[PDB]
Every structure is written in structure tokens, then in C-alpha cells.
Design a protein around this ligand. Structure first.
Ligand SMILES: [Mg+2]
Ligand SMILES: [Mg+2]
Ligand SMILES: [Mg+2]
Ligand SMILES: [Mg+2]
Ligand SMILES: [Mg+2]
Ligand SMILES: [Mg+2]
Lengths: 206, 124, 79, 96, 114, 98, 135
RNA sequence: CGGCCGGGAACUCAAAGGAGACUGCCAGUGAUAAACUGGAGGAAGGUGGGGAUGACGUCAAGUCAUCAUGGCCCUUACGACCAGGGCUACACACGUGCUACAAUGGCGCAUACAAAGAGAAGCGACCUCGCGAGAGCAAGCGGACCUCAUAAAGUGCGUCGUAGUCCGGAUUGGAGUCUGCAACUCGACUCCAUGAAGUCGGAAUCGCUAGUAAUCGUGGAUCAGAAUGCCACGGUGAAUACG
């Protein structure tokens, strides 16, 4: 373990939050409970949509929810089903008023939730893993990514011990708070174990 | 308008006004002798003025809040020197040799994680 | 020392007080409660206090004025 | 998590908001000095699992009774997890 | 000054000299000297028959020194014949008022018995 | 005559939110006092970072809440419409009274 | 200090007699940060000893410091610090009532200077002029 | 006689942007280079001090008990529900701590100086009764206004004049209060009375380089109720470094 988490420290510094509403000190717990409801159910229904990240916002007792993805065509659909049904069940959770938006994530391989969910979904497709690590390193490095590294953990290829073999190319100043860093973590579930993948992306200076 | 220096020291803050009258003491409408002029470190207010004639040459008026006794006393010690831009800058050579112009930086230290009092690693 | 203004007693034990007094010494009295405070009307009663597995046949004497059931029946076997 | 315990605490809220915070006037006004009519302390025994004294206020998503604080509801593990994933407005590591 | 028992306290302020007798302490001493109209900074020197028997009558308005001892004894006998939890701890030498029996009860349990 | 108290967290959010309510006030308004900074009663927390033992590994956090106050006295009906509909309420909530 | 030299961050001298040495002494006799109940005992003991010596004030303990000054164990700062420490911890052992008076009796026996202070001095001072081999 | 009404806008106060401390100029040493000593001014000197920030890896360290999770096991029972007892037992050892063993102390009276906090199912001023711990009334406060609240050592006076003492507070009897269905297994506090050992601690052992070491108060989180525990803040405020 031994490291601090990089996403929730660069907050007011170089990379803001993805949930910046305001709530009263009373019903804040039910507010974040409903936020977890929409996160879980949205990811569940948008399994194959490859959701990058989502923004919870409360614009004066409504809820604004923005969906950052590089893949908005499956979210939009034929303009009738795949947006207003989502805002409808969001409203149907607790009768709450809801607005909804999406946001295109340009350069569609430079989010770590995308990369880690790619490898997460590519494990159970019965391939080897070093190929996919090499793949993500090579293609995001040719298509940008001033720094990048990977980390996998646990039960690799049916082996006994949890080996890591983190793998890098670029420049990731982890202590340096100015560094533009995209980072997430996804989790797979194999037929014999649970693999954990961390992945660091270094965009730029400030 | 009046000749004024603020002055502050260790969670205190004074307000120091100078007239050219007589060096007797009003503090929060009270005597030096009724604050600590008999008690511990009584002449810490007198110490900068000692370098010149000071006895009855200038009225002094201090209003202070914050800290404790020596906090307010050091705030006075710094506030008098802060208010000494009345006459000139050019009496302050031996005042710098006294070093009284130096705003105190010996601030207290926070209680840290896993410790009892701020540097105190517990026994094992 | 305790129980400021009006003590606290039990529903079913309170009922069984009259169920034994107005209907004679049928059995020992069976309660799963250890709470109520002894009043002098209860003199001449075999009641039971359950300790965790087992009942004790408590008889009440005159000088049990402000005293209590589980205070009479400890629940720890020693040695 | 013991979803059984979760459903228990659901019942602990659901029986609470029916009787109590509204029928507590019996303890408030009538179980109080008005100078007797002791039938109210005779009636004092209630179904009694509607009391919030028997409510633990566990974690929300996980139901752990530790890590909890009423300001956030989730345990300190999920506090760190969400707080490092973002997930809370105006929250970051303290520094002085 | 053979008051209230065997104690003849001497050369004391009366506010502590009345604590000096068993069954009577500080607040009782202050109340007795208030009821007798006696200053706190006096000595037992220059004491008279009135200053004996007024004090003894005002304290004989209170439970003192013999009947208090056998009242403690009768309470203990009442708890032992009761056979309550508290009576059992009084009869077997264990801390009654809700302490832990495990560690550091040596006032009640005496010195260490190996 | 009015007590308009604004509430948010982020300082960079709230000061550029209130600059264009100060300018909206004294653009066509009357009797405007200035935005009050209202010291942040930020709340500190310290929680155990280990799931298991090591009490002495913890983690500290805080939440910083900024407020503002407006206090317009003159009934400037000319600019009460100018203050309406230019809310753009980007996560700021107010309470208003005397 | 494996690496650094001192700077010996200084202090403020005495209020009345203006001795930085006496200020260091009330810093010595201070426990738990009480200069006031230090200095009341200090000035009361010194005003007793001034009458009980019939001499001046500052020489009255300059005598009492020079006569309890040892040689080695050495530098004069540790000499006149350990001297005052010796007087304090000598007066701590006495069976008298108050601190000022037991300090006064210690300084009296250090005036007719066969006191417990020079008794404490003349064990290390006894190793001096008797073990002059080591260097 | 209270910042209290007309107010001032300058100072405290509080949050936004700038400055500033970088070996940036001076002498000597230094290959002519980073660097060391000293000086100037500067509130601040070579990280200004302090938190956050913990590389590859070792320790198959711990965590299937927050949760996810492979495999195993049970599945009219290791599952589900209620009442009640029990982690708070006690022949003993050790760790973490608390309060004292006293006069720099304890008491009684008069007595001035802060900080960061919390608060709506919450905080609770003011008055009246009880010596007091409590009860009723209701102002205000979603909060720099109102509440927690008049902090303590400190200073003067008078004191106890070395004792197990007016030090110390356990243990225990009684009488209380408030909480909560609930105080026996269990609490918190007031009072009356009791006054054990303990007069400075064997071998060993812990921390600490400046506002710290030590001492004295306070606030919070947990909670319906507790702190000597944890987190945080303030008052006073040392010694020594030849090595
Ligand atoms: Mg479960
Ligand atoms: Mg509870
Ligand atoms: Mg760093
Ligand atoms: Mg284990
Ligand atoms: Mg160091
Ligand atoms: Mg502690």
C-alpha cells in the first residue's frame, strides 16, 4: 500500500472534484446516499457504455447530473429512451426534481476509469495480461500521455502469489502537486480471485 | 490624528498611542502598579524607553486584548517600538542592538497525530 | 440512591401478584423479569428469578423495603 | 454486512416514526408533576422497540456500527474512499 | 474536653477540631459553629461548661459515634441476612459499588494474597 | 434593511460569484455596503486510516464553508429586477431575512 | 550536537537587581513555569541574608558562588551553573519549614563555608588534585 | 458610563489579490564552483518554524469482522426471531494511564489577562424554590449578535508551622437528583459521615533542542447517558550540550 491517494488531494489545486453541490448539515447523509444510488444504478445499466465519470450537482433543490463519457452516442440513442428514462428513475428514487446532461470526453483513451474498466473487462475474455499492458502503454503513449504507468495485483494467471509488475514509461511526479494527473481504480472478478488495477496518467505541468 | 503603533505578540494584540505629555500609565483604564508594576517582569514596558530620557516626557495610552499576562506584556514591548516612528527612524540603532524591533516568531506548536502533547511520543 | 420520583415495575409480574394473592399459593411464581421493587404486600410468596439458565425460589422478608429481584439473585457461579 | 441486521435497523426506524416522537407526550406531560392518576405509569410498558435508544445509527452502505459519525453516515473507510475519489463537496486533507 | 467520646482535642482551630471526632466532619463542623455562634479562628484554650454542653447538645441533635457504628453494623447484618449481591460482596470482601474485580481492587481485597 | 446571507464552500467560486452581484448592486442600485467575508467556521475531522490496529495511523480532513452578507438598505426597485434572473446559482445557497 | 555549535539564545535579566545571573537562577529554581512564586521566595531569602550578612547584596552571593565553585569534572559557565544547582538541591534535602529559610541556612553554612554545598563540591573537587593522570 | 445613538473610516478583527527570504548584493577562506564563517538592513537567514506529502522491496506482519471475493462447510440448522444472563468474573503477573505522598504546598476571602471549537429532535441566558447536584417559565440563536461560560495556576491579605498533618482521596453506610422502558449484574453528579496504604520509590526503564520539557484549564467526536482515553486550542514557562 504505503501511498496516499492522488485524486482526492489535487482538489482545489489543479484538478477539481466531480461532486460540488451544496447541502445543509442535516440531510447530507440521505443526499450522498441517493448520490450513491444513482452512481451504482447508472454504472449498472451503463455497463457497456464505458462511463468515464459523472458529476453530481444540486442546482437549487434539483439535481443536474452530468455524465462525462467519451461514448455519448449510446447515452443519447434515438433521442427518446436512453436519457429521459434515466432522469425519470432518478426522479423516481425520492420524488426529486432532476436535470441531466452529458459531456464528451475528447481523446477517448485518457481516462483511467476507461483504461482500468477496459482491462477489467478484458481479463475474463480469456487472454493474457502483459499483452494488454503493453497495448495500453503503446497506444496511449503514441496518442499522447506525457507520462503513464500501470499496476496490477492478485492471482495473475492462476499463480499462487499476488505479484504486481507495475510498468511505466514517461514521467509521473507523484509528490508534485502541480502535475496534471488522471487516475482511478477498477476491480475485476475472476473465477478464482479478485484483481486490483491502478493506473497513473500524467497529462501536463499545471 | 495620533501617533500610533499596533503591536502584537503570542496571540495578543495591543494598540499604542503617544502624546507628548508625561510618562504615567493608563492601561484598559488601569495602573501599571495595578496590572504588574509591582509583580513579575514589571519594567518590560519601561525597557525600550530606558535608552533616552523617558520619565515624564510623553503621555502613553495602551488598549490591549488577547493572550495572557506576558503575551500582552510582549505585545506592549513590540507596540511601543512599533509606535516609535513618531520622532524618527534615526534613534533606532541601539534599538536594533537591543533587537526589540523583531516581531516574535516563537509561535506555539500544534498537537500532532498519535501524540499526547505536540512532541510527546508516548512510553512503550 | 436511585429511581427519583416513582419507581418502575413490571406489567406481567404486577399481574401475577394479584394472580397469586387473589387466587392462593398455587405454584412458585414464574417471571422472565428481574425489575420490580418489593412492596410489603408480597410477603409470603415463592417467586422465581432466572439467572441466565435457572430459577431461584425467592421468598420475601419484611425488611426488603426498597430492594430488588436481581439484587437478591446474582448470576455468576464462582470457583 | 449482515443484510439481516440492515433490515432490522430498517424496522427500528419504521416502528419508531409510527409511535414515538408523537406518543412521547405520555412520558412528557402526564408522567410529570401536576400538583394521583398513576394509570399512565401503569401503562408505561410499550412495544418499546420503537425507541431510538435501541437504534445504533450504523453505516449506511455497509451497516458497520463503527467508523460512523452523524455528519456523514458512512464509516471512515468509505469516508476515505469517497473523499479520495472526490465524491464530497468542499472536502480535502486538513493542514496547519 | 471529654466531649462525644474519648477525644480531648487541643490547640486546634475548632473548624478542624470538630472533624477530629469520628462521625463528624467539615460541613457539620461549620454548621455547629454557626449554630453556636463561634468564630472559625479560635483555639480550644479558654473553654467553658457552656462551650462544652451547647456543642454537645447541638451534636446530640445528630446521630453520633455509638449508634452510628451499630447502625452500620445493623445495615451489614441486614444485607447478610438478606443475601443480596451487595451483601455477598460485603461478606466476602469484594468491591460493591460497581468496580472491576479483575485488576487493582487492593483496598477492598487487601494486600496481594498469592 | 435586507439581510442577504450567501453560503458556499469554494473561495474561487464564491468571490467571482459575488463580484458580479456587487457590480449588479452599484451598477443601477443604491445604498450598498460591500461584501462581508464572514470568517470560515471550517470543521476538522481526524479518523483512523487503518481498518485494523495502529490507532496511531490516522488521517485529517477539513471542510471550509464561506459565507457572504449583502445588506442593502434603500428600497432600490430599479435594481431589484437586475438582481433577479441573474442568479446563475452555481452551488450557492442563501438565506434572507431581517 | 554532532554537527552544530551553540548560539546560546539569551534571556531577560533580573527586574530589581538587574542580574542576568539571578535571572538564570530563578529559571533554575523555577519548576512548572512559576517565576512569581520562585522570585517571592528568592527575594525574601535574599533580603533575609542581607541583614544576616551585614554586607552588600550582589557580593553576598558572589562570595557564595566563588566558594562553591569547583575546578573540573572545567568551563566557567558550567561552573557557575552547577554551583547554583548545587545550592538548590542542597537546600532541597534540609528538614526546615520553608524554601527561603532552608536556602538561607544553606547559604549561612556556605558563608562559614563548610556547608553541604562545598561538601557536594569537594567530592569531584577531591578527585581533582588526587587523580591528575587522565588526559 | 455598558459601544450605547449620530458617526468615523484610520488601527484590532475577520478573507481576496500582491509583495517579501532568494545566498539577492559585502569581506575572508574557497582552482576562477557549488559551499562555510561574519556583517548590513529586513518582522523574519540560508527548509523562517510546523503539519500533509512515506521509492523500488523485505516482514507469506495484520485485516474473509466494513465491504467485495475463489474454494470449503451448514442449509427443519453453524441459518432466522424473542426474553434473559455474559465481555464489567478474580488465587495472580505486565503494559498504558490518573490522583497524591505535601509548605514552590493546601484552605478562605478580594482578585485581572485567551484560543480554536460546537449548536435546531440542539444550545440554553433571566427570574423563583432547594446550602448545593435539580424542577418550572420562556428571550435569543441555523448563528462572528444568543447559548456553552464568571477557566486555572498567578497577586495580595489571614491561615495550617512538619505531623499521615486542614495534604491525600480510595473503600463503605444513608439520603438524593437527572438520563433513559430500563441503574441488580452498570453508570454520572451533590451532600452527611468514614479517613487504609502511600512520607518519593529495588534491579531496570521512558520522553524531550524552544515556546518545546513540565504544569494548569477548556473545547469537540463517540452518544440517550459518562473520560483519567483520542483529536484540537490556549495560560505561564525552564536546564544542558565540552562532545
Ligand atoms: Mg452481508
Ligand atoms: Mg445509542
Ligand atoms: Mg515533500
Ligand atoms: Mg491473525
Ligand atoms: Mg531533532
Ligand atoms: Mg491520555
Amino acid at each position: 500500500g504505503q501511498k496516499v491517494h492522488p485524486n482526492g488531494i489535487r482538489l482545489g489545486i489543479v484538478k477539481p472534484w466531480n461532486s460540488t453541490w451544496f447541502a445543509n448539515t442535516k440531510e447530507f447523509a440521505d443526499n450522498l446516499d441517493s448520490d450513491f444510488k444513482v452512481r451504482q444504478y447508472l454504472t449498472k445499466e451503463l455497463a457497456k457504455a464505458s462511463v468515464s465519470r459523472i458529476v453530481i450537482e444540486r442546482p437549487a433543490k434539483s439535481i443536474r447530473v452530468t455524465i462525462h463519457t467519451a461514448r455519448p452516442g449510446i447515452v443519447i440513442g434515438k433521442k427518446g429512451e436512453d436519457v429521459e428514462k434515466l432522469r425519470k428513475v432518478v426522479a423516481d428514487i425520492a420524488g426529486v426534481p432532476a436535470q441531466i446532461n452529458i459531456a464528451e470526453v475528447r481523446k477517448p483513451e485518457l481516462d483511467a476509469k476507461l483504461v482500468a474498466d477496459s482491462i477489467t473487462s478484458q481479463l475474463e475474455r480469456r487472454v493474457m495480461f502483459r499483452r494488454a499492458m503493453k497495448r495500453a502503454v503503446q497506444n496511449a503513449m503514441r496518442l499522447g500521455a506525457k507520462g503513464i504507468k500501470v499496476e496490477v495485483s492478485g492471482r495473475l494467471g492462476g499463480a499462487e502469489i499476488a505479484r504486481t509488475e507495475w510498468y511505466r514509461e514517461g514521467r509521473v511526479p507523484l509528490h508534485t502537486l502541480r502535475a496534471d494527473i488522471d487516475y482511478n481504480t477498477s476491480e475485476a472478478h475472476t473465477t478464482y480471485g479478485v484483481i486490483g488495477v491502478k493506473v497513473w496518467i500524467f497529462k501536463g505541468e499545471i | 490624528n495620533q501617533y500610533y503603533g499596533t503591536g502584537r505578540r503570542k496571540s495578543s494584540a495591543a494598540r499604542v498611542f503617544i502624546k507628548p505629555g508625561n510618562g504615567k500609565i493608563v492601561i484598559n483604564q488601569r495602573s501599571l502598579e495595578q496590572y504588574f508594576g509591582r509583580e513579575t517582569a514589571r519594567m518590560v514596558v519601561r525597557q525600550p524607553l530606558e535608552l533616552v530620557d523617558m520619565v515624564e516626557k510623553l503621555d502613553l495610552y495602551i488598549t490591549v486584548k488577547g493572550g495572557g499576562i506576558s503575551g500582552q506584556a510582549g505585545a506592549i514591548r513590540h507596540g511601543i517600538t512599533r509606535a516609535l516612528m513618531e520622532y524618527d527612524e534615526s534613534l533606532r540603532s541601539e534599538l536594533r542592538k537591543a533587537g526589540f524591533v523583531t516581531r516574535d516568531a516563537r509561535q506555539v506548536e500544534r498537537k500532532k497525530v498519535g501524540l499526547r502533547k505536540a512532541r510527546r511520543r508516548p512510553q512503550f | 440512591r436511585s429511581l427519583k420520583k416513582g419507581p418502575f415495575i413490571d406489567l406481567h409480574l404486577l399481574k401475577k401478584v394479584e394472580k397469586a394473592v387473589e387466587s392462593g399459593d398455587k405454584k412458585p411464581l414464574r417471571t422472565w423479569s428481574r425489575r420490580s421493587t418489593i412492596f410489603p404486600n408480597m410477603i409470603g410468596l415463592t417467586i422465581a428469578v432466572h439467572n441466565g439458565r435457572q430459577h431461584v425460589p425467592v421468598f420475601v422478608t419484611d425488611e426488603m423495603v426498597g430492594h430488588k429481584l436481581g439484587e437478591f439473585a446474582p448470576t455468576r457461579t464462582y470457583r | 454486512a449482515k443484510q439481516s441486521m440492515k433490515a432490522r435497523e430498517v424496522k427500528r426506524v419504521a416502528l419508531a416514526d409510527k409511535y414515538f416522537a408523537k406518543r412521547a407526550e405520555l412520558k412528557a406531560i402526564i408522567s410529570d408533576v401536576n400538583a394521583r392518576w398513576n394509570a399512565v405509569l401503569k401503562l408505561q410498558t410499550l412495544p418499546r422497540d420503537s425507541s431510538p435508544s435501541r437504534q445504533r445509527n450504523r453505516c449506511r452502505q455497509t451497516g458497520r456500527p463503527h467508523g460512523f459519525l452523524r455528519k456523514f453516515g458512512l464509516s471512515r473507510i468509505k469516508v476515505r474512499e469517497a473523499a479520495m475519489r472526490g465524491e464530497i463537496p468542499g472536502l480535502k486533507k486538513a493542514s496547519w | 474536653a471529654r466531649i462525644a467520646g474519648i477525644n480531648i482535642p487541643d490547640h486546634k482551630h475548632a473548624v478542624i477540631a470538630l472533624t477530629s471526632i469520628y462521625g463528624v466532619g467539615k460541613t457539620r463542623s461549620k454548621a455547629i459553629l454557626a449554630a453556636a455562634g463561634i468564630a472559625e479562628d479560635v483555639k480550644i484554650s479558654e473553654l467553658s461548661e457552656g462551650q462544652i454542653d451547647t456543642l454537645r447538645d447541638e451534636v446530640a441533635k445528630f446521630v453520633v459515634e455509638g449508634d452510628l457504628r451499630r447502625e452500620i453494623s445493623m445495615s451489614i447484618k441486614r444485607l447478610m441476612d438478606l443475601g443480596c449481591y451487595r451483601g455477598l460482596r460485603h461478606r466476602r470482601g469484594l468491591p460493591v459499588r460497581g468496580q472491576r474485580t479483575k485488576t487493582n481492587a487492593r483496598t477492598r481485597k487487601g494486600p496481594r494474597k498469592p | 434593511r435586507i439581510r442577504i446571507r450567501l453560503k458556499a464552500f469554494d473561495h474561487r467560486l464564491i468571490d467571482q460569484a459575488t463580484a458580479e452581484i456587487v457590480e449588479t448592486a452599484k451598477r443601477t442600485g443604491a445604498q450598498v455596503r460591500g461584501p462581508i467575508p464572514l470568517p470560515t467556521r471550517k470543521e476538522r475531522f481526524t479518523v483512523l486510516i487503518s481498518p485494523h490496529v495502529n490507532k496511531d495511523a490516522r488521517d485529517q480532513y477539513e471542510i471550509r464553508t464561506h459565507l457572504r452578507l449583502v445588506d442593502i438598505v434603500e428600497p432600490t426597485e430599479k435594481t431589484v429586477d437586475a438582481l433577479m434572473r441573474l442568479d446563475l446559482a452555481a452551488g450557492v445557497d442563501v438565506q434572507i431575512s431581517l | 550536537p554532532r554537527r552544530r555549535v551553540i548560539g546560546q539564545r539569551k534571556i531577560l535579566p533580573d527586574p530589581k537587581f538587574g542580574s542576568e545571573l539571578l535571572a538564570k537562577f530563578v529559571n533554575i529554581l523555577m519548576v512548572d513555569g512559576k517565576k512569581s512564586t520562585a522570585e517571592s521566595i528568592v527575594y525574601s531569602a535574599l533580603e533575609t541574608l542581607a541583614q544576616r550578612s551585614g554586607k552588600s547584596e550582589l557580593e553576598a552571593f558572589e562570595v557564595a558562588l566563588e566558594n562553591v565553585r569547583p575546578t573540573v569534572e572545567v568551563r566557567p559557565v558550567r561552573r557557575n551553573a552547577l554551583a547554583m544547582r548545587w545550592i538548590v538541591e542542597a537546600a532541597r534535602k534540609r528538614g526546615d519549614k520553608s524554601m527561603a529559610l532552608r536556602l538561607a541556612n544553606e547559604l549561612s553554612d556556605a558563608a562559614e563555608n563548610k556547608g553541604t554545598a562545598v561538601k557536594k563540591r569537594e567530592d569531584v573537587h577531591r578527585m581533582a588534585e588526587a587523580n591528575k593522570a587522565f588526559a
